[PDB]
Subunit: 115 residues, 5 copies
Amino acid sequence: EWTGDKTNAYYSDEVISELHVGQIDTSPYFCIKTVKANGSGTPVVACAVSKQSIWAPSFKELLDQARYFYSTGQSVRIHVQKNIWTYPLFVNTFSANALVGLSSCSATQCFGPKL
Amino acid sequence: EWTGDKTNAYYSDEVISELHVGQIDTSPYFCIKTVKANGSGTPVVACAVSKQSIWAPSFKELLDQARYFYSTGQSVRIHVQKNIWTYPLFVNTFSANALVGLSSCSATQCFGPK
Amino acid sequence: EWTGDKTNAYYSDEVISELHVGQIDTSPYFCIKTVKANGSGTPVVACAVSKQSIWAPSFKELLDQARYFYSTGQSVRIHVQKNIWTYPLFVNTFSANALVGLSSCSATQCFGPK
Amino acid sequence: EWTGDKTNAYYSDEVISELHVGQIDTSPYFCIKTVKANGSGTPVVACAVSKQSIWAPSFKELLDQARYFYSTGQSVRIHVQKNIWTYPLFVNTFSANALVGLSSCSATQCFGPK
Amino acid sequence: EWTGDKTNAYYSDEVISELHVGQIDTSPYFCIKTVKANGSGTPVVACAVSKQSIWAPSFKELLDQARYFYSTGQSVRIHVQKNIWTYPLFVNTFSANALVGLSSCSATQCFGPK
Ligand SMILES: CC(=O)N[C@@H]1[C@@H](O)[C@H](O[C@@H]2O[C@H](CO)[C@H](O)[C@H](O[C@]3(C(=O)O)C[C@H](O)[C@@H](NC(C)=O)[C@H]([C@H](O)[C@H](O)CO)O3)[C@H]2O)[C@@H](CO)O[C@H]1O
Ligand SMILES: CC(=O)N[C@@H]1[C@@H](O)[C@H](O[C@@H]2O[C@H](CO)[C@H](O)[C@H](O[C@]3(C(=O)O)C[C@H](O)[C@@H](NC(C)=O)[C@H]([C@H](O)[C@H](O)CO)O3)[C@H]2O)[C@@H](CO)O[C@H]1O
Ligand SMILES: CC(=O)N[C@@H]1[C@@H](O)[C@H](O[C@@H]2O[C@H](CO)[C@H](O)[C@H](O[C@]3(C(=O)O)C[C@H](O)[C@@H](NC(C)=O)[C@H]([C@H](O)[C@H](O)CO)O3)[C@H]2O)[C@@H](CO)O[C@H]1O
Ligand SMILES: CC(=O)N[C@@H]1[C@@H](O)[C@H](O[C@@H]2O[C@H](CO)[C@H](O)[C@H](O[C@]3(C(=O)O)C[C@H](O)[C@@H](NC(C)=O)[C@H]([C@H](O)[C@H](O)CO)O3)[C@H]2O)[C@@H](CO)O[C@H]1O
Ligand SMILES: CC(=O)N[C@@H]1[C@@H](O)[C@H](O[C@@H]2O[C@H](CO)[C@H](O)[C@H](O[C@]3(C(=O)O)C[C@H](O)[C@@H](NC(C)=O)[C@H]([C@H](O)[C@H](O)CO)O3)[C@H]2O)[C@@H](CO)O[C@H]1O
Ligand SMILES: CC(=O)N[C@@H]1[C@@H](O)[C@H](O[C@@H]2O[C@H](CO)[C@H](O)[C@H](O[C@]3(C(=O)O)C[C@H](O)[C@@H](NC(C)=O)[C@H]([C@H](O)[C@H](O)CO)O3)[C@H]2O)[C@@H](CO)O[C@H]1O
């Protein structure tokens, strides 16, 4: 598996606009909400859950990176794998998207996998 | 168990106004006090205890998040579970609320269970 | 044991004015000096020593919190247990006080055990 | 092995312009892009993969330092080992360079091996 | 062993002006350069190596503290043990000094052994 796998999904020029920390089924988790820098579209929501899913090893790394990018409000590319979380109230509040990577962006290029 | 469970309680549009760190019964713990951003209402106090309660796994993440929101003074939704802590002097100093979640807010809308 | 035990000692309305990090007897440690925010009185000195004393579990949490309160210069209540460190040269340089808690203080109160 | 081994490659007077965090084959990884502070030349790209290669022990140290230098935009020397990473799409997206060191460069010569 | 042992050396009224991170012989390490705040004297260089020397246990604490004092520019007392590191190209790039302590300095005092 890789953040950049073609079967994952990514969204460019997003601003991390909200951040939530909680616990579910023995695991600390966090979720982020992102919106397009230009105000268009619908928000993207993605979560990472400690010790759950194949992405568990990167939980702390992604939490720390999401915190930083949230604090600056810079435009980023968010990478997700869809349809990972299944707890239904959790998905309804947040989403089933697993956060799998974050990339900084210049105005012309995001520094991370694409296509 | 989940932060968003109906059996928990939450308070929106709150600012973390005080922070305390200590140890009890070999466990580090911290407590926060929050107040409504507009100054109305009654303070909310909640604590997390590293080795105690079902919420023990989230101690470090909530400590780090509480510290961040404390440092910025931004408006948050604080999620607690009532009647968790039982040592009377501790409860009387702070409260029996376990801290179970923290959500950011933009204006009057917060990003978290409700 | 608890930060708030009556057999501990605390000092309110203090500012963390100095910070030292070192190692002793295989243990990283840190010490802080605090002084009254209003300039009166004599300093308080306390140390936390990584794998030493009953307070060892909270070493990292207290170091992180001391660094934060040091960086802001805000008024705090420092909680100590007296007569813990026994190495006389270490005590004479710093003190025998173990650091056991830190509480933010407003103009009117401190958020922690009294 | 050593960051400073002459078989490695380094670039002085750079700034960290981009940062990426992800996971591959159960390992956290990060990559950085650097460019000459003065705008000349071409970018340098390097990655660290937490579970992989002799450099694995320094993953967190390098990630933390990369984040700090990225946050400030200060001049740095970046040290890499060429021709390490193998997965073709990963290499094409980023590079085959392993990040093996970072040096501040706030004076005449960067503070690192040359 | 103790930071304050007379067999160590220290330098007051210094400011951390450079920081480097790397790895050698599977061990993460960092080095700092300090200069006198008033511009006099000769720079002090010291390194910590994560699993080498009797000072190995304090590696992370001193890296974190070095980073803190580097970022604030404040005047410090740096404590070293001389003649510890031995790899010649490393020693000639940096120095043989092990970093063993960091103490904040006001303007007439430093808070640490002397
Ligand atoms: C670039 C182009 O074809 N037309 C431009 C452009 O402004 C715009 O298209 C969108 O603009 C940028 C350019 O990359 C976006 O990056 C969109 O590409 C991606 C993305 O990286 O964000 C690709 C990605 O694979 C897509 N993810 C998924 C799951 O499908 C996303 C996603 O569709 C969008 O981010 C959702 O908003 O887009 C690119 O589509 C168009 C229309 O605005 O008009 C021209 O100006
Ligand atoms: C000061 C007071 O008593 N107010 C309530 C009144 O606000 C309440 O309905 C309110 O409806 C709005 C709709 O925008 C919000 O949903 C308020 O939500 C919460 C909150 O998010 O803060 C919900 C939460 O469940 C409540 N927490 C608990 C433990 O009950 C809090 C909480 O009451 C306040 O935060 C305390 O200051 O409010 C919601 O308050 C109606 C309900 O009868 O009338 C008043 O009682
Ligand atoms: C009085 C009663 O009815 N108790 C029952 C009993 O089944 C059980 O009591 C709790 O569970 C064990 C003992 O079985 C603990 O001794 C609880 O006491 C402490 C603890 O030792 O951990 C005291 C401690 O000071 C508290 N920590 C604080 C205040 O910071 C904790 C803390 O409140 C809890 O750990 C939170 O989960 O408890 C004792 O109260 C409980 C099982 O939950 O159920 C009662 O019906
Ligand atoms: C006009 C004026 O400033 N008068 C001060 C007077 O306020 C001050 O009294 C102190 O007021 C603070 C208020 O936060 C506390 O109530 C002090 O009580 C404690 C403390 O909390 O710090 C209680 C504590 O148990 C004591 N600790 C020990 C080991 O005994 C400490 C300790 O004695 C003092 O902190 C040392 O100064 O005090 C209360 O003393 C007094 C004393 O600072 O000085 C007037 O000028
Ligand atoms: C050399 C000098 O005193 N003054 C300028 C100078 O602007 C520039 O030369 C560069 O000067 C820097 C600052 O010390 C370095 O010395 C450059 O040498 C290195 C480097 O440290 O960056 C050595 C290194 O071994 C090289 N790495 C590899 C893999 O070969 C790099 C690399 O070639 C460059 O960084 C790529 O741009 O260079 C030194 O090049 C030149 C600019 O033309 O002009 C002098 O007058
Ligand atoms: C500091 C400078 O550049 N010039 C001198 C100054 O040396 C001299 O007195 C100095 O005053 C400072 C005040 O903090 C210290 O007391 C200096 O003592 C020490 C130190 O703590 O830095 C003692 C220490 O044991 C010495 N370390 C070693 C390995 O010998 C260091 C060391 O010699 C110096 O730091 C290196 O610069 O000095 C003390 O020397 C005053 C006269 O009082 O005049 C200045 O110009």
